[PDB]
Design a protein around this ligand. Structure first.
Ligand SMILES: *[C@@H]1O[C@H](CO)[C@@H](O[C@@H]2O[C@H](CO)[C@@H](O)[C@H](O)[C@H]2NC(C)=O)[C@H](O)[C@H]1NC(C)=O
Ligand SMILES: *[C@@H]1O[C@H](CO)[C@@H](O[C@@H]2O[C@H](CO)[C@@H](O)[C@H](O)[C@H]2NC(C)=O)[C@H](O)[C@H]1NC(C)=O
Ligand SMILES: *[C@@H]1O[C@H](CO)[C@@H](O)[C@H](O)[C@H]1NC(C)=O
Lengths: 410, 73, 56, 110
């Protein structure tokens, strides 16, 4: 009979979520969770404080789920304080409650749905491995999660990877546009990687269009936070922008709500079965200092290992998920994001066998014993050249091999 | 006094006497540049040195430092 | 704390007078009721403060 | 014609209600700077942090006066916080100067 709080702010199909709220199979454990859904606005944090205070005082809330539609990281930033200061854990699944901040508190109990910085770096390097582009550069601003990304990529790249330019931009100081334009002259690789904020991204794109380093031969790949919302397209995002976003198309709001309710319920069941005790103290909103006596110290240990009949919804120590589902987007000529490929379980899947462009001449050949030697890829090495073999049984299938020989050397 | 071609020959002699065999060519929109280009092209091809010449840098207007800097780099 | 407060208040006064020398005067909204828009000269005012120099 | 109106807030033992009241009063006041001068807090936590975070929610500069912990030195999280008392890391530079004076190279830092 645990109390679960669902808060929705912004436009959403509340009736559909309520109908799909009881879409889990929790009859195998005596939990009978109680779920209350309430709508809210994005007025101010203090309103949220009052709402959660009232909810926990009335229904004895042991778990809070927040979903919104804003593009501000402050939501989880302040929700971390509430999660740390209250014994009831909090979860974020969509909207402003999804972007991962720097870190959570030691006493924090707040978790999010999404991948870490390092996992995104790994996926982006997998993309660069898929299509043979090994020359790149990295530029980022002073958002806190920059050192993690830089060190992760450096360690991962430590195949002939060649990084030749790393840039750090501090946009707190104004009148630095001339300095930015001068220091962007160091970029020489065809591909440049960026890690900043949306408005900062627009400013940097203004500077780039001023210097004209984004026309045809240069393509940009950016993390999820740069895009954020597919519906809105900023003013001058160059055509061909590549990014990876959380799969929000095949994973809708009711699915997120069901997953959150299920993980909360099963963590509570694990805590109340393995230790035979469920921490459900007096949910007092006023003077919460005395309400923190019954510190769980093990529900978090049971909140980081959850299976949902196929879905390994385990979480990490920092607060992020372990097995996210990711999708890749591209900016075509008209301002929209297309669905190009998928990444899951360290596997990269691309729909286009060759990346379309925004001289070049194709070569046909055949294997000959001393002159053209073809072999399968490494479960291609140096001094070899990749080659594509079409398979006819469906959609046109190709398999990549490695071709070398006497003629190839010429 | 001498013309542009004689002075250009003297300049290439000076360059040879110090063995600076790698260079480029930067020209403005100042009139008489194409004759200098042609004279240099004819002088290099009949020389004992075998000079290394980079592509010629030609300015268009008062440099905007937008596309001219691309060639200057 | 007696001298520290005096030094801080003097620095604040001279910094505010330095800021008032420039244009684009912005004031915070009432964030307690439906105001989630940022103060636009936040980083600008911090930059104003960084270049501050004192002899008192 | 610039006018200066003075407003200060007192102490409460808690921190959630303290932060809530501080944020509400400062929002209703539309202040430009925030000053905290509590060296001898009975709680050893030394936490004026929520005021700084809420000021950074609107990019409102904060100037510390007492705490010298290096957590506030991190502008990546403390985006709108400053202070006029250097952290203990400057004592490391002082010890480096001492090493320069007495010609000491190998240390045992704990
Ligand atoms: C959840 O707990 C189970 C049990 O401890 C974990 O299963 C273990 O996983 C490790 C690492 O793969 C193995 O070395 C052990 O042999 C496994 N033991 C059992 C009994 O399965 C499982 O990995 C945990 N899941 C998460 C992600 O927390
Ligand atoms: C100057 O500041 C004082 C506070 O120091 C303001 O007085 C407050 O006014 C509000 C609104 O009426 C009350 O809720 C507070 O209780 C008052 N506090 C005190 C201590 O008086 C005053 O209104 C301000 N005046 C100006 C010039 O804005
Ligand atoms: C503290 O500062 C004041 C003002 O500068 C000074 O007069 C006083 O002597 C200082 N402290 C002491 C007790 O020395």
């Amino acid at each position: 009979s645990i109390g679960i709080a669902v808060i929705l702010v912004g436009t959403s199909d509340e009736v559909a979520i309520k109908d799909a709220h009881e879409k889990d199979d929790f009859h195998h454990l005596s939990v009978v969770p109680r779920v209350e859904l309430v709508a809210m606005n994005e007025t101010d944090p203090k309103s949220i404080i009052t709402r959660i205070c009232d909810l926990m005082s009335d229904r004895k809330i042991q778990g809070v789920v927040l979903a919104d539609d804003t593009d501000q990281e402050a939501i989880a930033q302040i929700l971390d304080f509430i999660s740390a200061q209250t014994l009831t854990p909090i979860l974020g699944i969509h909207g402003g409650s999804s972007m991962i901040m720097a870190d959570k508190d030691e006493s924090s109990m707040f978790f999010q749905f999404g991948p870490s910085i390092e996992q995104q770096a790994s996926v982006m390097l997998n993309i660069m491995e898929e299509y043979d582009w090994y020359i790149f550069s990295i530029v980022t601003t002073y958002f806190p999660g920059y050192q993690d990304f830089v060190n992760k990529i450096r360690s991962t790249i430590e195949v002939g990877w060649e990084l030749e330019e790393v840039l750090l931009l501090d946009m707190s100081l104004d009148d630095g546009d001339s300095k930015i334009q001068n220091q962007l002259k160091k970029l020489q690789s065809p591909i440049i990687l960026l890690y900043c904020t949306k408005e900062e991204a627009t400013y940097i794109f203004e500077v780039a269009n001023s210097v004209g380093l984004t026309g045809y031969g240069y393509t940009w790949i950016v993390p999820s936070l740069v895009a954020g919302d597919t519906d809105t397209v900023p003013s001058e995002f160059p055509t061909g922008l590549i990014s990876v976003s959380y799969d929000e198309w095949d994973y809708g709001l009711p699915a997120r709500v069901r997953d959150g309710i299920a993980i909360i319920t099963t963590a509570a069941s694990d805590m109340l079965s393995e230790h035979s005790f469920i921490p459900e103290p007096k949910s007092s909103c006023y003077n919460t200092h005395e309400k923190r006596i019954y510190q769980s110290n093990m529900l978090n240990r049971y909140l980081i290992n959850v299976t949902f009949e196929g879905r390994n919804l385990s979480f990490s120590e920092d607060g992020y998920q372990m097995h996210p589902k990711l999708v890749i987007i591209l900016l075509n000529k008209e301002r929209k994001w297309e669905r190009v490929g998928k990444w899951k379980d360290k596997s990269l899947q691309m729909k286009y066998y060759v990346w379309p462009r925004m001289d070049h001449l194709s070569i046909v050949t055949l294997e000959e014993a001393p002159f053209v030697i073809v072999e399968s890829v490494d479960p291609c090495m140096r001094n070899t050249v990749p080659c594509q073999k079409r398979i006819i049984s469906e959609e046109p299938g190709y398999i990549k091999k490695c071709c070398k020989g006497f003629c190839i050397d010429i | 006094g001498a013309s542009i071609q004689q002075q250009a020959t003297v300049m290439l002699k000076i360059m040879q006497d110090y063995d600076w065999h790698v260079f480029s060519l930067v020209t403005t929109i100042f009139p008489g540049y194409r004759d200098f280009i042609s004279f240099i092209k004819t002088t290099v091809d009949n020389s004992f040195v075998g000079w290394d010449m980079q592509n010629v840098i030609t300015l268009d207007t008062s440099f905007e430092d937008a596309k001219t800097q691309v060639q200057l780099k | 704390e007696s001298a520290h407060i005096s030094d801080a208040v003097g620095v604040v006064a001279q910094a505010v007078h330095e800021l008032l020398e420039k244009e684009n005067i912005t004031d915070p909204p009432r964030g307690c009721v439906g105001n989630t828009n940022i103060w636009k000269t936040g980083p600008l005012f911090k930059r104003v403060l960084m270049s501050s120099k004192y002899a008192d | 014609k610039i006018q200066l109106n003075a407003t200060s807030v007192t102490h409460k033992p808690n921190a959630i209600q303290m932060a809530l009241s501080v944020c509400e009063d400062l929002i209703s006041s539309q202040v430009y700077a925030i000053l905290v001068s509590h060296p001898p807090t009975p709680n050893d936590h030394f936490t004026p942090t929520p005021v700084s975070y809420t000021a950074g929610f609107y990019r409102i500069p904060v100037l510390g006066l007492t705490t010298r912990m290096s957590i506030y030195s991190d502008k990546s999280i403390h985006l709108s916080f400053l202070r006029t008392v250097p952290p203990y890391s400057h004592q490391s530079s002082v010890w480096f100067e001492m090493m320069r004076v007495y010609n000491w190279n190998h240390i045992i830092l704990l």
